[PDB]
Symmetry: C6
Subunit: 177 residues, 6 copies
Amino acid sequence: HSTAIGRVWLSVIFIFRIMVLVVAAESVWGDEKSSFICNTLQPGCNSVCYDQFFPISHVRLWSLQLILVSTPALLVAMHVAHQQHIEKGTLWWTYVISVVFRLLFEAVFMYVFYLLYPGYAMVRLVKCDVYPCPNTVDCFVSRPTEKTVFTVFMLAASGICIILNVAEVVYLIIRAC
Amino acid sequence: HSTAIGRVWLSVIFIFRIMVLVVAAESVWGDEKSSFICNTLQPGCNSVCYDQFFPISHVRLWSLQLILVSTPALLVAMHVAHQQHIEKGTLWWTYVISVVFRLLFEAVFMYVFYLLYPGYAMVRLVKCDVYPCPNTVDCFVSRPTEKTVFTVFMLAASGICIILNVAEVVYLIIRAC
Amino acid sequence: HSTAIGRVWLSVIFIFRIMVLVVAAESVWGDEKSSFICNTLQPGCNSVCYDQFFPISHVRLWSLQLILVSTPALLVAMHVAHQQHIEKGTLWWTYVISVVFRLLFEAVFMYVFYLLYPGYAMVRLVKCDVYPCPNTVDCFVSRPTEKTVFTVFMLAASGICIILNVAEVVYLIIRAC
Amino acid sequence: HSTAIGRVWLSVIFIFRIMVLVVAAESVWGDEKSSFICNTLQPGCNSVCYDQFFPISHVRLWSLQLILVSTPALLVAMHVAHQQHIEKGTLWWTYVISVVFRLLFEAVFMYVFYLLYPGYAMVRLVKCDVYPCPNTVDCFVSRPTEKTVFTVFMLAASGICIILNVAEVVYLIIRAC
Amino acid sequence: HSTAIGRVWLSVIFIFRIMVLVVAAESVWGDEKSSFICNTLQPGCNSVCYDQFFPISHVRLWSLQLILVSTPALLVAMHVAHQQHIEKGTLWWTYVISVVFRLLFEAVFMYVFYLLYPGYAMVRLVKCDVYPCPNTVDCFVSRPTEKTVFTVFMLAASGICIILNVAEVVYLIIRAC
Amino acid sequence: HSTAIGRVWLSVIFIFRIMVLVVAAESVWGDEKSSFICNTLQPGCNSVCYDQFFPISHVRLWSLQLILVSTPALLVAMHVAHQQHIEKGTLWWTYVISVVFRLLFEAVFMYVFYLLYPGYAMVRLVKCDVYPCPNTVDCFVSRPTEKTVFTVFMLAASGICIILNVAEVVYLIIRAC
């Protein structure tokens, strides 16, 4: 019932994103806070500086994005199961709405990533002047390069997903006409 | 036998809550106590201050809420299985009672969350004057911003669940009349 | 073959107890010993004080109670399978004996909990004077409030199980007469 | 083909032992070495004293005992599967030999437990004079009381298994005559 | 439909690589950063030196390589499932393209491994002069020999995979002619 | 198609080895490096001494041995599946070659174990004079006795496997004649 190009490629990219996120969360981001250390004797400086520079981790943002993108499909599948229960083209329009919602969810999460972390690259040293840290202190980020590489992978996959969703919408519209 | 709107949407929101809780418990709240540090030399100040400011963690409250909400459905399913065994509209009234009980459980857990943690936001610094901490000491909370974001997500999902349960009850009453 | 009220409610409460124990063991009681600290310079004081005040953890007692309660049912199921193998009301009396044994196991574990930990509430500070700790030292318990809440939940569930088992026995006796 | 009393009771006790061992290994014995501390400034004293007083942990001995007891049954099942393949009372004698081997394995492991750890109870303080510890030093054992309780449980279960195996052998001999 | 030699040998080598990577990631590379220590009093020297000498771990590179190699096959299987859905030699050419893409992915990952880590062997001591480390400091790598052995295993397996893919392409071309 | 004695006994011993390795890896060898401490103030001495005395852990060697022994059987099973696909005594000779390869893999791993760790027993104290450790320092090995016991178990099982493989080859040759 769905288009040929859409489902297969979207599922493959989604599985790739899930695998990459699993690897990165299991390994790369495990000690992002425990090994985060600042050059100071001020108690509590490490925690406040980490909170200031990492309001929410990249892994958590990616997990939330994947969940939000998935629940359209779960809702559509539940509605299809309910239709089957009733049995014992509004479905097409519902599928279009779900695809559109997935596209907006991806775009919103990309914009949030841009707002929170301008730039894909992660730096080794950050300057933190948040209370109670006196003046400005230097803090050091765990595995900036590996995190940058995984961030690039996730952003490229998300952009590919966005383009694929747009192409799927265009193809479905052409099918309608 | 049940209403069209209710089961699908409630199940989707419940699965979303489960996924969010799994992510947050696995990652965000893991080091809520180990990295909780106060600015003092008093032994035992950290533990008593953490206990005073976090009588029970947000993750544990959400887990208890999900279990309490779930066991109505488990009890109804067990009763249905027992009815099937007997085979080898009291069921409708039992379903209404279970939905009502789920609604009250959600409302009670929301009220408990309001009582224990007034306000969704978590602060970086807390003032603790609990024995044996001398005078008032400053203590620093791990990942206040990420915890605030996840708390907002869970509260919004719980409110949506409450509204959906109320709408389901109203729809079932309209069906009765 | 069994009573209507008994099996469903007992299974629901048992599953609730299992879920609560899983959550508490995974989260609440993980650092009960590592974060247990006393105010002293005496080596080995922490370990002996923890052993004196926690001969066996609440989680371990609950796990042992659940296993002991379960093995009646496992033995009855194995005997039923053996009867099926023989095929290729002594069963009723065996079921009554198993229910009675479960009731006594619950009562004995409740009495043991009363003996070891008089009172549901857990205190923040304990006074320990066990060798080699000099005079009396103060030791601080991790998460007393959350542990108290979970203890209350488990005790209420166990009491409900005891009452349900007694009611099941009475109903079965009435069926006999 | 087997006796009525034997298989069911032996399987129930074996499952009980497995559950108890799982709980104890997951929880009780996790920090047996990390929290093992001696009252000395000598480097390496903790490790040598722990090795001297715990050549092999109770959990590891129980795991080895369970594996050794199990592999008779696994070998018998594999031989039965091979007989089925051949199809596409030597079996009785093989079953007797397997039961006898299980009985000797249980007895040997009980004797090893007696040799290594005379007495079920675990003490809080041990006196260690192993090189390079100077003179005699005091070392403190983690959770002696809980370990003693679990040791008592495992020893009682093992003794019940031994008695059950002996009774099964006697019953099978009576069947032969 | 596929060649005799290719699928079986490629699957066996892929499973071998997966098993080796699982073992190494679980055990060898767990403490690559936590036990990475430099001989200095400069705060943050350890983290920057580890980032400089390990931009991305060997385990993460191998995981990414395996995922990238796998997704060709997953995409081909999804396309085959879509063809089956349509049912309710373009496939040959698609299989050739997927095999070619796997070969290039293996070659690119081998070249990346050569660029990042010239030489299979890992050294015990590295010289790090990255800010803020003053002058040049010595840092010590955890388990260089075991990591070297596992690196040799993975590189040999990857080379065997490359040769097997080339042979499969040649055999398929010969089949075409 | 295979011999009666071979498959059953080899599978039983292989499963026993897998279980023992799982237990030992989960428990005994977990802190082989973290608790490895030398008597010195030299930074990096612990890591270089551990690398010098443990180039690769016993658990990792056993895991590699089991994987290498297994992949013959996996390759043979894959070839059998391919033969089944073709359907939709070269197999005997392939089975002999696989058994021979397993025997050589076991022998080679035994020889490697002899080379790396002469003697089954593990000592408490080792003398390390590897740079940058000044002169000779004493280092202490975690759980030498338990590791020795598990090493003896694994070596005995491996020797039994070697003898069983040789006997299987002899029996198959006798079958050929």
